[PDB]
Amino acid sequence: KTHVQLSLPVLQVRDVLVRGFGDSVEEVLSEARQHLKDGTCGLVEVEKGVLPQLEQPYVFIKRSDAAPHGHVMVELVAELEGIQYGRSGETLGVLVPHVGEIPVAYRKVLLRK
């Protein structure tokens, strides 16, 4: 399938134990995709002061369309020193590894895989 229905745990930035996916744009996009597939990916909602508490490169999920079965269609865009790799809509949040942190909510997305 080109798209996969996922329910992503929404984590508070100060709870997150592993604050990024790795060290290159290519690695973080790779790792993000692997964690999304394995159900080990959390979502942090971006507000004032959130991104400086996470590790670059960042992986965003961005709205790709204006929502089958409640699932917002999204795609992955990476960022490193203010340059983005990808072009998409509005940010739903930043992806991070999930290692058992307690979520505050779940974000239903349809991920272009």
mmCIF file with all atom_site columns, C-alpha atoms in Angstrom:
data_model
loop_
_atom_site.group_PDB
_atom_site.id
_atom_site.type_symbol
_atom_site.label_atom_id
_atom_site.label_alt_id
_atom_site.label_comp_id
_atom_site.label_asym_id
_atom_site.label_entity_id
_atom_site.label_seq_id
_atom_site.pdbx_PDB_ins_code
_atom_site.Cartn_x
_atom_site.Cartn_y
_atom_site.Cartn_z
_atom_site.occupancy
_atom_site.B_iso_or_equiv
_atom_site.pdbx_formal_charge
_atom_site.auth_seq_id
_atom_site.auth_comp_id
_atom_site.auth_asym_id
_atom_site.auth_atom_id
_atom_site.pdbx_PDB_model_num
ATOM 1   C CA . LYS A 1 1   ? 0.000   0.000  0.000  1.00 0.00 ? 1   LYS A CA 1
ATOM 2   C CA . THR A 1 2   ? 1.217   3.572  -0.834 1.00 0.00 ? 2   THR A CA 1
ATOM 3   C CA . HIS A 1 3   ? -0.553  4.801  2.381  1.00 0.00 ? 3   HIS A CA 1
ATOM 4   C CA . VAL A 1 4   ? -0.824  3.293  5.912  1.00 0.00 ? 4   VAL A CA 1
ATOM 5   C CA . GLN A 1 5   ? -3.297  4.289  8.680  1.00 0.00 ? 5   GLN A CA 1
ATOM 6   C CA . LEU A 1 6   ? -1.343  5.029  11.889 1.00 0.00 ? 6   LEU A CA 1
ATOM 7   C CA . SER A 1 7   ? -2.323  6.290  15.385 1.00 0.00 ? 7   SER A CA 1
ATOM 8   C CA . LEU A 1 8   ? 0.783   8.163  16.688 1.00 0.00 ? 8   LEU A CA 1
ATOM 9   C CA . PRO A 1 9   ? 1.244   8.717  20.457 1.00 0.00 ? 9   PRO A CA 1
ATOM 10  C CA . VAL A 1 10  ? 1.575   12.477 21.182 1.00 0.00 ? 10  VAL A CA 1
ATOM 11  C CA . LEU A 1 11  ? 4.460   13.006 23.669 1.00 0.00 ? 11  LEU A CA 1
ATOM 12  C CA . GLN A 1 12  ? 5.300   16.091 25.797 1.00 0.00 ? 12  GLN A CA 1
ATOM 13  C CA . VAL A 1 13  ? 8.785   17.338 24.680 1.00 0.00 ? 13  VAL A CA 1
ATOM 14  C CA . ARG A 1 14  ? 10.171  17.163 28.310 1.00 0.00 ? 14  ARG A CA 1
ATOM 15  C CA . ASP A 1 15  ? 9.208   13.402 28.543 1.00 0.00 ? 15  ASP A CA 1
ATOM 16  C CA . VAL A 1 16  ? 11.060  12.423 25.337 1.00 0.00 ? 16  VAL A CA 1
ATOM 17  C CA . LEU A 1 17  ? 14.097  10.194 26.116 1.00 0.00 ? 17  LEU A CA 1
ATOM 18  C CA . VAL A 1 18  ? 15.489  9.885  22.535 1.00 0.00 ? 18  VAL A CA 1
ATOM 19  C CA . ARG A 1 19  ? 15.226  13.371 20.983 1.00 0.00 ? 19  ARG A CA 1
ATOM 20  C CA . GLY A 1 20  ? 15.966  12.488 17.325 1.00 0.00 ? 20  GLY A CA 1
ATOM 21  C CA . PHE A 1 21  ? 16.458  9.730  14.749 1.00 0.00 ? 21  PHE A CA 1
ATOM 22  C CA . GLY A 1 22  ? 20.155  10.310 13.912 1.00 0.00 ? 22  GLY A CA 1
ATOM 23  C CA . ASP A 1 23  ? 22.809  12.488 12.371 1.00 0.00 ? 23  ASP A CA 1
ATOM 24  C CA . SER A 1 24  ? 21.994  13.017 8.610  1.00 0.00 ? 24  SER A CA 1
ATOM 25  C CA . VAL A 1 25  ? 18.823  14.106 6.715  1.00 0.00 ? 25  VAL A CA 1
ATOM 26  C CA . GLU A 1 26  ? 18.912  10.697 4.951  1.00 0.00 ? 26  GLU A CA 1
ATOM 27  C CA . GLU A 1 27  ? 19.354  8.712  8.236  1.00 0.00 ? 27  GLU A CA 1
ATOM 28  C CA . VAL A 1 28  ? 16.547  10.515 10.170 1.00 0.00 ? 28  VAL A CA 1
ATOM 29  C CA . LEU A 1 29  ? 14.060  10.024 7.243  1.00 0.00 ? 29  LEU A CA 1
ATOM 30  C CA . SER A 1 30  ? 15.159  6.312  7.048  1.00 0.00 ? 30  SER A CA 1
ATOM 31  C CA . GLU A 1 31  ? 14.870  5.774  10.849 1.00 0.00 ? 31  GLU A CA 1
ATOM 32  C CA . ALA A 1 32  ? 11.534  7.714  11.012 1.00 0.00 ? 32  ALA A CA 1
ATOM 33  C CA . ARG A 1 33  ? 10.095  5.416  8.282  1.00 0.00 ? 33  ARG A CA 1
ATOM 34  C CA . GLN A 1 34  ? 11.423  2.284  10.098 1.00 0.00 ? 34  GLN A CA 1
ATOM 35  C CA . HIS A 1 35  ? 9.878   3.414  13.491 1.00 0.00 ? 35  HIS A CA 1
ATOM 36  C CA . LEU A 1 36  ? 6.555   4.356  11.797 1.00 0.00 ? 36  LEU A CA 1
ATOM 37  C CA . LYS A 1 37  ? 6.428   0.812  10.256 1.00 0.00 ? 37  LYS A CA 1
ATOM 38  C CA . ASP A 1 38  ? 7.433   -0.861 13.645 1.00 0.00 ? 38  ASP A CA 1
ATOM 39  C CA . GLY A 1 39  ? 4.908   1.219  15.712 1.00 0.00 ? 39  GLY A CA 1
ATOM 40  C CA . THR A 1 40  ? 7.804   2.799  17.711 1.00 0.00 ? 40  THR A CA 1
ATOM 41  C CA . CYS A 1 41  ? 7.329   6.456  16.551 1.00 0.00 ? 41  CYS A CA 1
ATOM 42  C CA . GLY A 1 42  ? 5.935   9.314  18.691 1.00 0.00 ? 42  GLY A CA 1
ATOM 43  C CA . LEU A 1 43  ? 4.824   12.843 17.690 1.00 0.00 ? 43  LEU A CA 1
ATOM 44  C CA . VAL A 1 44  ? 5.692   16.120 19.471 1.00 0.00 ? 44  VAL A CA 1
ATOM 45  C CA . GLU A 1 45  ? 3.437   19.104 18.644 1.00 0.00 ? 45  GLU A CA 1
ATOM 46  C CA . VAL A 1 46  ? 5.557   22.138 17.692 1.00 0.00 ? 46  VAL A CA 1
ATOM 47  C CA . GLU A 1 47  ? 5.207   25.277 19.857 1.00 0.00 ? 47  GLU A CA 1
ATOM 48  C CA . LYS A 1 48  ? 7.553   28.069 21.056 1.00 0.00 ? 48  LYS A CA 1
ATOM 49  C CA . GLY A 1 49  ? 10.639  26.418 22.622 1.00 0.00 ? 49  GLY A CA 1
ATOM 50  C CA . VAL A 1 50  ? 9.936   22.801 21.503 1.00 0.00 ? 50  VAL A CA 1
ATOM 51  C CA . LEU A 1 51  ? 12.395  22.440 18.568 1.00 0.00 ? 51  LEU A CA 1
ATOM 52  C CA . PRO A 1 52  ? 15.503  23.729 20.457 1.00 0.00 ? 52  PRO A CA 1
ATOM 53  C CA . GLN A 1 53  ? 14.803  20.888 23.006 1.00 0.00 ? 53  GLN A CA 1
ATOM 54  C CA . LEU A 1 54  ? 15.003  18.255 20.194 1.00 0.00 ? 54  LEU A CA 1
ATOM 55  C CA . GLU A 1 55  ? 18.014  17.111 18.084 1.00 0.00 ? 55  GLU A CA 1
ATOM 56  C CA . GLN A 1 56  ? 18.544  18.087 14.399 1.00 0.00 ? 56  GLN A CA 1
ATOM 57  C CA . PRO A 1 57  ? 18.071  16.868 11.804 1.00 0.00 ? 57  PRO A CA 1
ATOM 58  C CA . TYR A 1 58  ? 14.269  17.126 12.555 1.00 0.00 ? 58  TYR A CA 1
ATOM 59  C CA . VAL A 1 59  ? 11.622  14.939 10.838 1.00 0.00 ? 59  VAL A CA 1
ATOM 60  C CA . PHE A 1 60  ? 8.220   16.710 10.420 1.00 0.00 ? 60  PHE A CA 1
ATOM 61  C CA . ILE A 1 61  ? 4.886   15.175 9.407  1.00 0.00 ? 61  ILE A CA 1
ATOM 62  C CA . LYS A 1 62  ? 3.125   17.765 7.170  1.00 0.00 ? 62  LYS A CA 1
ATOM 63  C CA . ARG A 1 63  ? -0.496  17.696 5.847  1.00 0.00 ? 63  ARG A CA 1
ATOM 64  C CA . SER A 1 64  ? -0.289  16.503 2.167  1.00 0.00 ? 64  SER A CA 1
ATOM 65  C CA . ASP A 1 65  ? -4.060  16.997 1.343  1.00 0.00 ? 65  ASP A CA 1
ATOM 66  C CA . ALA A 1 66  ? -7.288  18.756 2.679  1.00 0.00 ? 66  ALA A CA 1
ATOM 67  C CA . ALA A 1 67  ? -8.916  12.962 5.882  1.00 0.00 ? 67  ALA A CA 1
ATOM 68  C CA . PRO A 1 68  ? -9.983  9.327  5.209  1.00 0.00 ? 68  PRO A CA 1
ATOM 69  C CA . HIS A 1 69  ? -11.658 7.652  8.273  1.00 0.00 ? 69  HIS A CA 1
ATOM 70  C CA . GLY A 1 70  ? -10.427 10.556 10.565 1.00 0.00 ? 70  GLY A CA 1
ATOM 71  C CA . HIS A 1 71  ? -6.776  10.011 9.371  1.00 0.00 ? 71  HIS A CA 1
ATOM 72  C CA . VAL A 1 72  ? -5.125  13.258 8.064  1.00 0.00 ? 72  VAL A CA 1
ATOM 73  C CA . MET A 1 73  ? -2.905  12.482 5.028  1.00 0.00 ? 73  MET A CA 1
ATOM 74  C CA . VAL A 1 74  ? 0.711   13.443 5.836  1.00 0.00 ? 74  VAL A CA 1
ATOM 75  C CA . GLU A 1 75  ? 4.220   13.067 4.419  1.00 0.00 ? 75  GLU A CA 1
ATOM 76  C CA . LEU A 1 76  ? 7.751   13.327 5.915  1.00 0.00 ? 76  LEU A CA 1
ATOM 77  C CA . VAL A 1 77  ? 9.923   16.482 5.525  1.00 0.00 ? 77  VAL A CA 1
ATOM 78  C CA . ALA A 1 78  ? 13.413  16.667 7.196  1.00 0.00 ? 78  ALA A CA 1
ATOM 79  C CA . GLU A 1 79  ? 15.132  19.920 8.349  1.00 0.00 ? 79  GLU A CA 1
ATOM 80  C CA . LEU A 1 80  ? 18.854  20.640 9.117  1.00 0.00 ? 80  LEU A CA 1
ATOM 81  C CA . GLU A 1 81  ? 20.267  24.184 9.764  1.00 0.00 ? 81  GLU A CA 1
ATOM 82  C CA . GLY A 1 82  ? 17.089  25.797 8.329  1.00 0.00 ? 82  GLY A CA 1
ATOM 83  C CA . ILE A 1 83  ? 17.010  23.790 5.043  1.00 0.00 ? 83  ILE A CA 1
ATOM 84  C CA . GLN A 1 84  ? 14.033  21.377 4.454  1.00 0.00 ? 84  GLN A CA 1
ATOM 85  C CA . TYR A 1 85  ? 14.205  18.244 2.254  1.00 0.00 ? 85  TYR A CA 1
ATOM 86  C CA . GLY A 1 86  ? 10.682  17.960 0.947  1.00 0.00 ? 86  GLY A CA 1
ATOM 87  C CA . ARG A 1 87  ? 7.846   20.386 0.317  1.00 0.00 ? 87  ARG A CA 1
ATOM 88  C CA . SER A 1 88  ? 4.390   19.763 1.893  1.00 0.00 ? 88  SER A CA 1
ATOM 89  C CA . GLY A 1 89  ? 1.619   21.532 3.889  1.00 0.00 ? 89  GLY A CA 1
ATOM 90  C CA . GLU A 1 90  ? 1.279   22.566 7.551  1.00 0.00 ? 90  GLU A CA 1
ATOM 91  C CA . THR A 1 91  ? 3.310   20.756 10.293 1.00 0.00 ? 91  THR A CA 1
ATOM 92  C CA . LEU A 1 92  ? 1.285   18.354 12.510 1.00 0.00 ? 92  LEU A CA 1
ATOM 93  C CA . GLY A 1 93  ? 4.451   17.858 14.633 1.00 0.00 ? 93  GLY A CA 1
ATOM 94  C CA . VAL A 1 94  ? 8.030   16.521 14.890 1.00 0.00 ? 94  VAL A CA 1
ATOM 95  C CA . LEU A 1 95  ? 8.591   12.731 14.948 1.00 0.00 ? 95  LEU A CA 1
ATOM 96  C CA . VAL A 1 96  ? 10.790  11.104 17.637 1.00 0.00 ? 96  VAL A CA 1
ATOM 97  C CA . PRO A 1 97  ? 11.482  7.528  18.724 1.00 0.00 ? 97  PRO A CA 1
ATOM 98  C CA . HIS A 1 98  ? 8.893   6.234  21.211 1.00 0.00 ? 98  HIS A CA 1
ATOM 99  C CA . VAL A 1 99  ? 10.517  4.092  23.968 1.00 0.00 ? 99  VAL A CA 1
ATOM 100 C CA . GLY A 1 100 ? 7.461   3.791  26.322 1.00 0.00 ? 100 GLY A CA 1
ATOM 101 C CA . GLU A 1 101 ? 6.798   7.438  27.341 1.00 0.00 ? 101 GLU A CA 1
ATOM 102 C CA . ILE A 1 102 ? 3.104   8.005  28.348 1.00 0.00 ? 102 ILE A CA 1
ATOM 103 C CA . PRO A 1 103 ? 1.274   9.985  25.636 1.00 0.00 ? 103 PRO A CA 1
ATOM 104 C CA . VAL A 1 104 ? -1.162  12.922 26.238 1.00 0.00 ? 104 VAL A CA 1
ATOM 105 C CA . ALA A 1 105 ? -3.125  12.027 23.044 1.00 0.00 ? 105 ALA A CA 1
ATOM 106 C CA . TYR A 1 106 ? -3.120  10.076 19.749 1.00 0.00 ? 106 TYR A CA 1
ATOM 107 C CA . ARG A 1 107 ? -2.905  11.674 16.271 1.00 0.00 ? 107 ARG A CA 1
ATOM 108 C CA . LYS A 1 108 ? -4.573  9.544  13.505 1.00 0.00 ? 108 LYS A CA 1
ATOM 109 C CA . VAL A 1 109 ? -2.647  10.033 10.214 1.00 0.00 ? 109 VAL A CA 1
ATOM 110 C CA . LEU A 1 110 ? -2.602  8.406  6.751  1.00 0.00 ? 110 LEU A CA 1
ATOM 111 C CA . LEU A 1 111 ? 1.154   8.200  5.946  1.00 0.00 ? 111 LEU A CA 1
ATOM 112 C CA . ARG A 1 112 ? 2.418   8.261  2.322  1.00 0.00 ? 112 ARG A CA 1
ATOM 113 C CA . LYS A 1 113 ? 4.946   5.339  2.609  1.00 0.00 ? 113 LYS A CA 1
#
